[PDB]
A paper describes a structure:
Here, we report crystal structures of four states of dSNFRRM1 at 2 Å resolution or better: the free dSNFRRM1 (residues 1–96; dSNF1–96), dSNF1–96–dU1SLII, dU2A′–dSNF1–96, and dU2A′–dSNF1–96–dU2SLIV. Altogether with the characterization of dSNFRRM1 dynamics alone and in complexes by NMR spectroscopy and targeted mutagenesis combined with binding studies, we delineated how the intrinsic dSNFRRM1 RNA-binding capacity and specificity are fine-tuned by networks of intra-molecular interactions that modulate dSNFRRM1 dynamics, and how the auxiliary dU2A′ protein can capitalize on intrinsic dSNFRRM1 flexibility to gear dSNFRRM1 binding specifically to dU2SLIV.
Comparison of the six crystallographically independent dSNF1–96 molecules indicated intrinsic conformational flexibility in the RNA-binding surface of dSNF1–96, predominantly affecting loop L3 (residues 42–51; Cα root-mean-square deviation (rmsd) 0.16–1.10 Å with a maximum displacement of 1.47 Å) and to a lesser extent L1 (residues 13–19; rmsd 0.10–0.14 Å with a maximum displacement of 0.21 Å), as well as side chain conformations in the Tyr-Gln-Phe motif. Furthermore, the conformations and positions of the N-terminal extensions (residues 1–7), which in one case forms an additional α-helix, and the C-terminal loops L6 (residues 84–87) and α3 helices (residues 88–94) differ among the six dSNF1–96 copies, in agreement with solution NMR data showing that the latter element undergoes extensive ps-ns motions.Fig. 1 dSNF1-96 structure and conformational flexibility. a Sequence alignment of dSNFRRM1, hU1ARRM1 and hU2B″RRM1.
Residue numbers in the entry: 3 to 94
The structure:
Amino acid sequence: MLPNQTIYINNLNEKIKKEELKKSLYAIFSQFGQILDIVALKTLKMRGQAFVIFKEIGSASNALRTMQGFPFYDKPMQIAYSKSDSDIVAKI
């Protein structure tokens, strides 16, 4: 799976309000480089999931390799590169 600028995260703690979850994701991912956006909706389709869109592909790679399994709100994050441009959109 080729690297791309967006990482897809699941196994996120669903008890956390989305505004807070997004701020906390920025807190931990901003070290990897400039973040263009973080998406985490309170829809059934997006339960436990988020996308972090980095400016640079290399930042997404370093984020993925460093934070894989990191216990965030006491739950290990599962991180993958996004599979395609149509992916976020499908999740809305």
